[PDB]
Amino acid sequence: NDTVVVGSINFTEGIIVANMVAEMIEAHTDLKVVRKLNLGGENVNFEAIKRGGANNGIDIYVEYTGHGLVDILGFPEPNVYITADKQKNGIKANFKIRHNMEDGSVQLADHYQQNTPIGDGPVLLPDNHYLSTQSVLSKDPNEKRDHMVLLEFVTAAGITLGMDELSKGEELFTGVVPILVELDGGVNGHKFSVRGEGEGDATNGKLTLKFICTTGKLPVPWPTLVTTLVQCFSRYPDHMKQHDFFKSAMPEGYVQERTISFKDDGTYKTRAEVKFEGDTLVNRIELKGIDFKEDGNILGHKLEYNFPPPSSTDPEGAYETVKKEYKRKWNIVWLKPLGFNNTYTLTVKDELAKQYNLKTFSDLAKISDKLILGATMFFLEGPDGYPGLQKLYNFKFKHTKSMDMGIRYTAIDNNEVQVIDAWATDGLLVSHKLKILEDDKAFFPPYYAAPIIRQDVLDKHPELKDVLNKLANQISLEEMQKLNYKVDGEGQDPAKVAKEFLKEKGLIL
């Protein structure tokens, strides 16, 4: 029982950090340590550590906060990605909601959305951006009716202020606006009505609403109706205020049509008119749900009364969100960060960048048709990589070829490929005369690495927390770059560099 399991993915950095963790545990404790190295897969560690060292899994492994968000929250999907549809003079939007269940499961809700101005006046057709939403569901203790108290914060992002620059409907949201919401719905023949009253502050992006089921008991769980039940109250920062389509349609309003597909269950089809009446912003919705299962998760009320927390783009917020959602669900402890952010970045030959005056990803996308992308498997398959990039940046590459790590640097050196997915810790970025490009639309989450341990393993031997926090903020990105290079440039074995570093900083000896 004295032994423990430490897992790792198969890439240069992960093996090194796993050997570092093992050396720490064997030095500052008298514990036996195993070094498991799982390969391939899709989010493999997560499953291995869900199993544990007893079920031939893992107990401790190093994870990055962005991939953690992808694990627990499915990072790119909860963001409401908005693009412009010039045909219908409006906008289109895509996202997914992950409804928690009692048995740790997740019910998927795929949202496709169209918005079309009701009036015939001019409206703002925006560039690709996204809405980040935080939703808090609660109850009134004194309300005997079936209800939901909802409090929302919506902020727009995905557009940069480049220190180079400076509507009629917006003037209607300067103060606090009353909000009426009326939803007439039918799901599998169940007819119901929901009436919600509240207020909205668009300058802060805050919504405070109370919804009541005026027809008795609601035949569906409340969180499935949260998206359906006022995107004009989103806080748009000044530097992208000319991209708020919703406020520009006011006071005439807009039609919001939505198709919500529940995985392995029925679907909602909703049409709403969001418009001003007197001084009140009203949202009138007709909802028709069909093909639902009577004992399913929706018609069986198998969804918890909560909402997944928002996947933040701020490093501190990202770390804390991932730590909280790992501890709450699946009972997994995030330890202190090692102090280096190994993020994806689209790097080019700096000669090419000088030739085409490429500074940011947006500059790269406008000429992406002439270029070839050589990316790793994890960047072409992971939703936090190229597929998630494309729903914000509109990259149109001529070719995309998955390549083993290290092959991509020697391939961009010989112009077999123009753009590669360089990881910031690869020491090869300086030695190949390359250039990282600015992720101006801020799609990528923070990828600060930190170790991860199970709670029961932390309980059987309680000293592991302190012995693994010896590495907290000890490895800078440039330090890790030198060591990664020692493994990738020179032929040195991974464990040797780990022992050397821990001797150098006075940890292993």
Ligand X SMILES: c1cnc2cc3c(cc2n1)[C@@H]1CNC[C@H]3C1
CB-wise, 51 or 301, nearer to ligand X?
51
CB of 422 to ligand X, least distance (A): 10
- Find the shortest distance in angstroms from Cβ 445 to ligand X: 10
Q: Which is nearer to ligand X, 152 or 421 (CB)?
A: 421
Least Cβ distance, residue 356 to ligand X (angstroms): 26
Taking the least distance from each CB to ligand X, the nearer of 9 and 392 is 9
Taking CA atoms, 187 is separated from 42, 144, 156, 218, 334, in Å, by: 35, 24, 32, 10, 41
DSSP for 132-191, written as a single string: EEEEEEE--TT--SSEEEEEEEEEEES----SS---TGGGGGSSEEEEEEEEEEEETTEE
Q: Which is nearer to ligand X, 7 or 219 (CB)?
A: 7
Question: In what helix (H) or strand (E) does residue 268 lie, and over which residues does it extend?
Answer: strand 267-277
Selected binder of ligand X within 6, 12, 61, 67 (CB under 6 A): 67
Nearer to ligand X by C-beta: 43 or 138? 43
Residue 342 or 418 having the CB closest to ligand X: 342
Note whether 395 binds ligand X by CB under 6 A.
Answer: no
**Would you tell me the crossing angle of helices 494-504 and 12-28 to the nearest 10 degrees?**
50
**Number of residues lying near ligand X (CB under 6 A):** 10
Measured from the CB atom, the residue of 228 and 345 that comes closer to ligand X is 345
Sheet holding 32-35, edge to edge: 32-35, 3-6, 60-64, 449-454, 332-334
DSSP letters for 175-239: SEEEEEEEEEEEETTEEEEEEEEEEEETTTTEEEEEEEETTSS-SS-GGGGTTT--GGGSB--GG
Query: Which of 75, 95, 344, 443 touches ligand X by CB under 6 A?
Result: 344
Tokens 């909560």 identify what position?
306
CB of 19 to ligand X, least distance (A): 16
CB of 384 to ligand X, least distance (A): 8
Closest separation in Å from C-beta 43 to ligand X = 6
Q: How far is the CB of 9 from ligand X (least distance, A)?
A: 6
Q: Which of 130, 222, 447, 485 binds ligand X (CB under 6 A)?
A: 447
Q: Which residue is nearest to ligand X (CB)?
A: 378
Q: Which of 22, 24, 64, 218 binds ligand X (CB under 6 A)?
A: 64
CB 28 within 8 A of CB 467: yes
Residues 173-232 that bind ligand X (CB under 6 A): none
The residues, any chain, with a CB within 8 Å of residue 198's CB and separated by 6 or more, are 150, 178, 179, 181, 207, 208, 209, 210
Which CB atom, from 344 or from 397, has the smaller least distance to ligand X? 344
Rounded Cα–Cα distance for residues 238 and 64 (Å):
32
The distance of closest approach from Cβ of residue 18 to ligand X in the complex, given in angstroms and rounded to an integer, is 12
Rounded alpha-carbon distances, angstroms, from residue 351 to 369, 417, 431: 18, 13, 14
Q: Which is nearer to ligand X, 67 or 235 (CB)?
A: 67
Contact by Cβ (8 Å): 302, 317: no
Q: Least distance (Å) from ligand X to the CB of residue 396? A: 23
Q: How far is the CB of 400 from ligand X (least distance, A)?
A: 17
- 67 versus 111: smaller Cβ distance to ligand X: 67
Nearer to ligand X, 234 or 343 (CB): 343
Closer CB to ligand X, 17 or 150, in the complex: 17
Give the Å distances, CA to CA, from 72 to 309, 325, 391, 499: 10, 7, 20, 33
Which amino acid is it at 423? W
Q: Which of 19, 321, 342, 368 binds ligand X (CB under 6 A)?
A: 342
Footprint (CB under 6 A) of ligand X, residues 361-390: 378, 382
Binders in 7-36 for ligand X, by CB under 6 A: 9
Structural contact between residues 338 and 473, judged by C-beta atoms closer than 8 angstroms: yes
Judged on CB neighbours under 10 Å (0-12, 13-18, 19+), 86 is exposed
The least CB distance from residue 37 to ligand X, in Å, is 14
Coil vs helix vs strand at 497: helix
Options 211, 233, 245, 423; binder of ligand X; rule CB under 6 A: 423
Measured distance CA(484)–CA(25) in Å, rounded = 22
> DSSP letter at 124?
-
Spatial distance between the Cα atoms of 64 and 48, rounded to a whole number of angstroms: 16
Strands 32-35 and 434-436: unpaired
Query: Where are the extended beta strands (E) located within 301-390?
Result: 332-334, 344-349, 372-375
Residues at the interface with ligand X (CB under 6 A): 9, 43, 64, 67, 342, 344, 378, 382, 423, 447
